[PDB]
Design a protein around this motif. Structure first.
Motif, PDB file in Angstrom:
ATOM      1  N   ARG A 165       0.572  12.777   5.625  1.00  0.00           N
ATOM      2  CA  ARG A 165       1.763  13.596   5.440  1.00  0.00           C
ATOM      3  C   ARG A 165       2.708  12.960   4.425  1.00  0.00           C
ATOM      4  N   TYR A 166       3.651  13.751   3.926  1.00  0.00           N
ATOM      5  CA  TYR A 166       4.615  13.265   2.946  1.00  0.00           C
ATOM      6  C   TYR A 166       5.961  13.964   3.113  1.00  0.00           C
ATOM      7  N   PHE A 167       7.000  13.179   3.375  1.00  0.00           N
ATOM      8  CA  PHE A 167       8.342  13.721   3.556  1.00  0.00           C
ATOM      9  C   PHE A 167       9.019  13.961   2.211  1.00  0.00           C
ATOM     10  N   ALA A 168       9.297  15.226   1.913  1.00  0.00           N
ATOM     11  CA  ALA A 168       9.945  15.591   0.658  1.00  0.00           C
ATOM     12  C   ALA A 168      11.444  15.319   0.715  1.00  0.00           C
ATOM     13  N   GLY A 169      12.006  15.375   1.919  1.00  0.00           N
ATOM     14  CA  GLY A 169      13.427  15.133   2.086  1.00  0.00           C
ATOM     15  C   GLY A 169      14.251  16.397   1.941  1.00  0.00           C
TER      16      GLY A 169
ATOM     17  N   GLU B 225      14.859   7.158   4.392  1.00  0.00           N
ATOM     18  CA  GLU B 225      14.645   6.256   5.518  1.00  0.00           C
ATOM     19  C   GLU B 225      13.157   6.107   5.819  1.00  0.00           C
ATOM     20  N   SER B 226      12.426   7.214   5.723  1.00  0.00           N
ATOM     21  CA  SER B 226      10.992   7.208   5.989  1.00  0.00           C
ATOM     22  C   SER B 226      10.205   6.886   4.722  1.00  0.00           C
ATOM     23  N   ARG B 227       8.901   6.690   4.878  1.00  0.00           N
ATOM     24  CA  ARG B 227       8.035   6.373   3.749  1.00  0.00           C
ATOM     25  C   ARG B 227       7.082   7.527   3.454  1.00  0.00           C
ATOM     26  N   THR B 228       7.164   8.060   2.238  1.00  0.00           N
ATOM     27  CA  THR B 228       6.311   9.169   1.831  1.00  0.00           C
ATOM     28  C   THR B 228       5.386   8.761   0.690  1.00  0.00           C
ATOM     29  N   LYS B 229       4.105   8.598   1.003  1.00  0.00           N
ATOM     30  CA  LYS B 229       3.116   8.210   0.003  1.00  0.00           C
ATOM     31  C   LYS B 229       1.849   9.049   0.139  1.00  0.00           C
ATOM     32  N   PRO B 230       1.075   9.134  -0.953  1.00  0.00           N
ATOM     33  CA  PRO B 230      -0.175   9.899  -0.980  1.00  0.00           C
ATOM     34  C   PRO B 230      -1.269   9.254  -0.136  1.00  0.00           C
TER      35      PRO B 230
ATOM     36  N   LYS C   9      -2.270  -3.648   7.974  1.00  0.00           N
ATOM     37  CA  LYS C   9      -0.911  -3.367   8.422  1.00  0.00           C
ATOM     38  C   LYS C   9       0.020  -4.532   8.102  1.00  0.00           C
ATOM     39  N   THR C  10      -0.499  -5.750   8.229  1.00  0.00           N
ATOM     40  CA  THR C  10       0.285  -6.947   7.953  1.00  0.00           C
ATOM     41  C   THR C  10       0.771  -6.965   6.509  1.00  0.00           C
ATOM     42  N   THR C  11      -0.137  -6.685   5.579  1.00  0.00           N
ATOM     43  CA  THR C  11       0.199  -6.669   4.161  1.00  0.00           C
ATOM     44  C   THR C  11       1.343  -5.703   3.878  1.00  0.00           C
ATOM     45  N   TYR C  12       1.222  -4.484   4.392  1.00  0.00           N
ATOM     46  CA  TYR C  12       2.246  -3.466   4.193  1.00  0.00           C
ATOM     47  C   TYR C  12       3.586  -3.922   4.764  1.00  0.00           C
ATOM     48  N   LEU C  13       3.559  -4.417   5.996  1.00  0.00           N
ATOM     49  CA  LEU C  13       4.771  -4.889   6.657  1.00  0.00           C
ATOM     50  C   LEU C  13       5.492  -5.922   5.799  1.00  0.00           C
ATOM     51  N   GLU C  14       4.731  -6.864   5.250  1.00  0.00           N
ATOM     52  CA  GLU C  14       5.298  -7.909   4.406  1.00  0.00           C
ATOM     53  C   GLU C  14       5.878  -7.319   3.124  1.00  0.00           C
TER      54      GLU C  14
END
Length: 99
Positions: free
Chosen positions: A36-40, A47-52, A84-89
């Protein structure tokens, strides 16, 4: 409560749902997949993360960890899975620079 989610690169326009599922079952066991992708649509900041990128959840613990570590590696199409660790960092450092 325990929740697990993996992040994997998006798929091409040629890769259909039927093809993706079939290939998946052929190698590796996954529970479900979604994206999913939040257009806003508000007067507030992002606040949220919207990526392909696509989100995949493995059912098997063993297969889950195996895939999490390294990608499936398919001759047909190059697969790129992240941890998940990589992204979190990544996000952690990002906000750190901003604030």
């Amino acid at each position: 409560t325990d929740h697990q989610t993996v992040y994997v690169k998006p798929v091409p326009p040629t890769a259909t749902l039927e093809q993706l599922t079939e290939f998946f079952s052929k190698h590796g066991t996954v529970q479900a997949v979604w994206r999913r992708y939040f257009a806003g649509k508000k007067d507030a900041p992002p606040e949220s993360r919207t990526k392909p990128s696509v989100f995949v959840v493995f059912n098997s613990s063993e297969e889950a960890e195996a895939f999490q570590k390294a990608p499936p590696m398919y001759d047909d199409v190059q697969l790129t899975a992240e941890m998940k660790t990589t992204y979190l960092e990544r996000k952690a450092e990002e906000i750190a620079a901003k604030k």
